[PDB]
């Protein structure tokens, strides 16, 4: 089949997918929401135990099989073939949720071109009454309804939630966001139409730019006065509330979404070349660099937050407690507005966001567009371009549901419902099929001689008990404790909670309905049926 070619290009694409605008969006936000310092100490061990097996085993299976992500299960467990459609639906939901954020970032990049950025002062298009956050000398009198210029810019300019009274009420049209989505999808299509050649050609040029932007932002934030309270709040042990009512399950979900295992993209990337004697090293290097990037992102987030809190002369907690997605887009907005080096830092930060989001959504769409073609050979023969066009069509059609609605409500719903229980139980089914059903002995007997080292005594005991135990504990705790939704002082109703639970439990029903279809098409009785249907070809 197709070969990756440059090993450096392959590894760079893997680490560029590992680094995610979604991770940069979720990790520091939920960290500051749950307490800040009490998020990184019980983080690295869970990150290891949750991602290192799910990354290494998946990469090994991909490099051993090299037949895509949907048709790969035919040689392991054909009963669990519905996991391919599950991964497809989950990636579609992720792209539908991700394109709106990409459009927001690109619109911010476009609007950050004027010399007078609309973040230093509220203009003639926002509520100047609510707009009062201006750092003067004894001129601010905070009240129960005090807002910020960046908050108003995020609320009544790009999202326009003031016209939407909730999920039960529709919203107005957004032609600017529609054109932004059109441009982003055109770029994605022009980058994904050719194939793996352009895949490797576009990633290597947008890979070091986010890193250099992160480094220059860190070295800039390390100079502004007031970067001490932020790091002190970011480095507090706080051993009080991590035993039972802790945020461990949200940290696990976040690191899972950041490393992105079981999303089919890693399996599809490993399904190209054999990649001998480098699977373990690739997995470890990718996970380490992703964890380091997430740590640097959280560090700069908390540095900027502490600088803002010290300039405001108030605690770090009160700054954007209810703003879920708006936290970043108001904090960095006010940071650029306060720093005397504006009109360039905002531009480079938005360009870093655009590059990261492009790389992430490109890998996410590729992990499906190169996996469905293996299941559909008649399509893969000639109609690859038409199938790419059709999947782009349906992707932006699904994104239009959130676009026309004009609100981040569906965005938050997909943020804490799509990439949560659905992909969690998908990874659980994958791990169960790899460990219990498929023999770990014969699964490792080949990678042993392929990598020259013995993977025993760590994965032989991690893949069987601790990883599935944690991955099931997280999901049962999630199903037991309803994650109440809050956004912009708007409590989501019980009907919204029920709809979220329904979409979460239906985003993976394809696997059991395919199991039932296979059981009803296969004749006979239960025992012989299962013993001749669970046959790794």
């Amino acid at each position, epitope marked *: 089949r197709e070969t990756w070619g440059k090993k450096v290009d392959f590894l760079l694409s893997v680490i560029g997918y590992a680094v995610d605008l979604g991770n940069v969006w979720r990790f520091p936000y939920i960290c500051y929401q749950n307490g800040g310092g009490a998020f990184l100490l019980p983080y690295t061990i869970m990150a290891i135990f949750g991602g290192i097996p799910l990354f290494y085993m998946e990469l090994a299976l991909g490099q051993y099989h090299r037949n895509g992500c949907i048709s790969i299960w035919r040689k392991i467990c054909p009963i669990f073939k519905g996991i391919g459609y599950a991964i497809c639906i989950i990636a579609f939901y992720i792209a539908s949720y991700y394109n709106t954020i990409m459009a927001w970032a690109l619109y911010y990049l476009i609007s950050s071109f004027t010399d007078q950025l609309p973040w230093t*002062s509220c203009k003639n298009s926002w509520n*100047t*009454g609510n707009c009062t956050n201006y750092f003067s000398e004894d001129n601010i009198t905070w009240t129960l309804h005090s807002t910020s210029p960046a908050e108003e810019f995020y609320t009544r300019h790009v999202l326009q939630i003031h016209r939407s009274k909730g999920l039960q009420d529709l919203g107005g049209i957004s032609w600017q966001l529609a054109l932004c989505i059109m441009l982003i999808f055109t770029v994605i299509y022009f980058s994904i139409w050719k194939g793996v050649k352009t895949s490797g050609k576009v990633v290597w040029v947008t890979a070091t730019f986010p890193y250099i932007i992160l480094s220059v932002l860190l070295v800039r934030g390390a100079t502004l006065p007031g970067a001490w309270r932020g790091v002190l709040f970011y480095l507090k042990p706080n051993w009080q509330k991590l035993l039972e009512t802790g945020v461990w399950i949200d940290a696990a979900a976040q690191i899972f979404f950041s490393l992105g295992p079981g999303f089919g993209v890693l399996l599809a990337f490993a399904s190209y070349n054999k990649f001998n004697n480098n699977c373990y090293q690739d997995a470890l290097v990718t996970s380490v660099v992703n964890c380091m990037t997430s740590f640097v992102s959280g560090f700069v987030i908390f540095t900027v937050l502490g600088y803002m809190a010290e300039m405001r002369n108030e605690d770090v907690s009160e700054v954007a407690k209810d703003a879920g997605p708006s936290l970043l887009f108001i904090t960095y907005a006010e940071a650029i507005a306060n720093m005397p080096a504006s009109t360039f830092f905002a531009i480079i930060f938005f360009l870093m966001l655009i590059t990261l989001g492009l790389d992430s959504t490109f890998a996410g769409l590729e992990g499906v567009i190169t996996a469905v073609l293996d299941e559909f050979p008649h399509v893969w023969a000639k109609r690859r371009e038409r199938f790419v066009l059709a999947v782009v069509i349906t992707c932006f059609f699904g994104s239009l549901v959130t676009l026309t609605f004009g609100g981040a409500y569906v965005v938050k719903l997909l943020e804490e419902y799509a990439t949560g229980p659905a992909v969690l139980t998908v990874a659980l089914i994958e791990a169960v099929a790899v460990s219990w059903f498929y023999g770990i002995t014969q699964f490792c007997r080949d990678v042993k001689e392929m990598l020259g080292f013995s993977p025993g005594w760590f994965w032989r005991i991690c893949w069987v008990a601790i990883s599935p135990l944690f991955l099931l504990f997280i999901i049962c705790s999630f199903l037991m404790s309803p994650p109440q939704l809050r956004l912009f002082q708007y409590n989501y109703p019980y009907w919204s909670i029920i709809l979220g639970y329904c979409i979460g439990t239906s985003s993976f029903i394809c696997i059991p309905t395919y199991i039932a279809y296979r059981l009803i098409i296969t004749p006979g009785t239960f025992k012989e049926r299962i013993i001749k249907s669970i046959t790794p070809e």
Partner: antibody
Amino acid sequence: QVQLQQSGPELVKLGASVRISCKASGYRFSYSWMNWVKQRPGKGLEWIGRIYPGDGDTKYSGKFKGKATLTADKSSSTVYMQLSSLTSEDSAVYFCARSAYGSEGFAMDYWGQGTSVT
Amino acid sequence: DIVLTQSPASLAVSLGQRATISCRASESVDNYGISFLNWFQQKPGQPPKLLIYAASNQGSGVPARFSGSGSGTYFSLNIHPMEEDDTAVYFCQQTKGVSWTFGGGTKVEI
């Protein structure tokens, strides 16, 4: 409240320059715009320009940017309008309005007494 | 610069009947769901007085007899039958950026 007090009447000569003051008080004048209108005797209203005290943002229009200039004073809470090349055509009475907030549509709720500059 | 036009120019209606004031333009001033339009009450000698908030809401201190609605290009000012003192000229103001222009003016008399 309604405290947009202005000065008395001025004298107009061919090629002169006058200054019209506008004392603002009773609200956050550092975050609200200040508008200036022009009304001729027996004619309708004409817009001159707007000024945002606190940031110096000015947006002149109405073919008046060549002879009018707005200046804000946060220390004295006054709004000044610099005039130049006065003529009997534009010699009329000028007011001093105050724009509302964003959700209110920037409506001139509070007005001044009026400077009968003739 | 966006120009506003008013029609009719004079309304010689008596006491006891309602009237309508029109303020048309190429815009389409609707932005963020807020119709940028303001109606003023200018009496001879007296400064103008604000009547309508964003062409949909009533102002402060104005009696409930003043009202009006509209969307996009077409804007109307449905006024209750006026009294012997409510006779005055009315202007419509467009507050959409970046330039602000006033209307012509109607001669509401009895």
